Design a protein around this nucleic acid. Sequence first.
RNA 1: CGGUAAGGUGAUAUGAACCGUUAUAAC
RNA 2: AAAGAACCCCGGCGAGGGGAGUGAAAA
RNA 3: ACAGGUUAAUAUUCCUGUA
RNA 4: CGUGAUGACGAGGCACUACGGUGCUGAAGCAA
Lengths: 32, 65, 442
Amino acid sequence: ETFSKIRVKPEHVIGVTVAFVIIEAILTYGRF
Amino acid sequence: TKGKATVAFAREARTEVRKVIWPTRKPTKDEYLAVAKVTALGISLLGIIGYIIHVPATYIKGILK
Amino acid sequence: KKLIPILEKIPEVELPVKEITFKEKLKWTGIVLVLYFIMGCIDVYTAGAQIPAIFEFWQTITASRIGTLITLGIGPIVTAGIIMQLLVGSGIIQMDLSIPENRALFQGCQKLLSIIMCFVEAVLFVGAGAFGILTPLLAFLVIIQIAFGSIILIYLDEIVSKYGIGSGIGLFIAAGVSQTIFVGALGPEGYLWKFLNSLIQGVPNIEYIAPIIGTIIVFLMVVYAECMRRRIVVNYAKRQQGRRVYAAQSTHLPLKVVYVSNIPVILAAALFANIQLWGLALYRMGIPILGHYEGGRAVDGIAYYLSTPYGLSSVISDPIHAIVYMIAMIITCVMFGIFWVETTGLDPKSMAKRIKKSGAFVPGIRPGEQTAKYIEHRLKRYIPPLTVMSSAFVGFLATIANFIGALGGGTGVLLTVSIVYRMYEQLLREKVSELHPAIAKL
RNA sequence: CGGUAAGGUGAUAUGAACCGUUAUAAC
RNA sequence: AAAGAACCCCGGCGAGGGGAGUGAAAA
RNA sequence: ACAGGUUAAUAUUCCUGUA
RNA sequence: CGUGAUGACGAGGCACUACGGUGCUGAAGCAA
């Protein structure tokens, strides 16, 4: 298995990704 | 040295089997076509899904660039 | 002792021993798929709306898309895996995985490196002049986003890998190519139209429909492989009574042909990917170690001799160039292939158990099936080739698939077609495992 | 050669592959 | 009329049995 | 038609060497 | 008795291995 002392539930990575999208999706576009 | 000989032989011995394995329907008036079907069908779904998303977003980007 | 400290700091994915319904593995996969396509729609935050064309060579095997939140794509992950297979391959760092140690060592380790290669590539990309404006400030910002997007994939892969079907990478690649096709041919600036329109305009352009053909041909060719197949077996045995039938007969087959050299060739092509990148990079940022690019790609040097010819039409105007590449790829394939042995691959040991039960044994009755139980050598022998064969077989079909040249990437189409079929199989082994909650190993 | 006909390839006998539905299925 | 008892449990992936359903009835 | 050699199971029968 | 046979086999070693076992090599090889 994995020696990853930390456990991360997928629901997070998904939501964290919805994060990158929103941020840059607006950080870039929607100028001004 | 010998190593190369054996390796070269194995390839030949295999080519021989390919000869025996065919009869059926070379392979079958349904088999081959199948792979292409499922394969193409799968690529279509993945490709189609990409098209939706993709192209609509491009229209907007251009129309607001 | 090992890099266990930071290694234990690198997050992972919570694998539930709960009920993960087919319907859920499916629905999961799909969510990953979309976040992907989506990320491929979003440009990287960068004022310099002007970018120097594109690298028509890295995108395909990388499943990336330069200029987007995934401009680096699977590229790192592949790079990483490439090194590992290189070290743990040429014995340089001999390891007998067997033990959950070496196994989880080889892995965990590689994973880390993937994040290392995640940033490296990022920097290398911008440093290769993938965007044009090297505003130390803006440059930094970009790299951030870039490698971080690739990170998300690394974790999205993990998700699919433990919450859905098939594989992230495998998926991703097929995801990209498929799209690259459906869009290139039919999308906005679609080719089918550019051709169709060119017909209406009255100036029939054979160059607009061409690439579309290239792809059909390639598909039919790369597919021809997934056609053959034995048939098959077989076994036998009866005397049922275990308290409920037990007639016993014996499984069948066959299975198909190709795929094995899948991950291998993915690495060969990916090697070349990191050369054309690493050469240009270490070109407009140093000395011409690898080759003199100019014009974007390379027009001389190791780089030149190792640049796949595809795109639209096959290039005859350089025979020698062809020859070398081919041979160059071929051998590179044999390599990673061998390095896949020292590691792991389609093994008889494994097929032994499972090709020695189909039937019965037991007490009730005399159902035959002797098999079997000491006759494995019959596989490892008949086996060797199967996967292969290879660096020239698989590597050849891929390379020549590029001379011909096609939409999405001759080679890309290949992997895809395979990945897609190995993905169909996955969907079946599942549609069935969704019945008898046990035979999760037959 | 005649009758007959949506059903058939005798039984334990399923499955598999096939033959027929209008006048060379089968009986 | 096979609807000849899916599925769950003890038991030696036994024997046998207890539930669960089929059935007008498993008296 | 002999001596070696060989199969999980055949043998002056199969392989070899020599009749 | 020659030859068959500077061939084979051959104590034992160098190898893998599932632990049924398998490869490379190889001394003496005569007389009463």
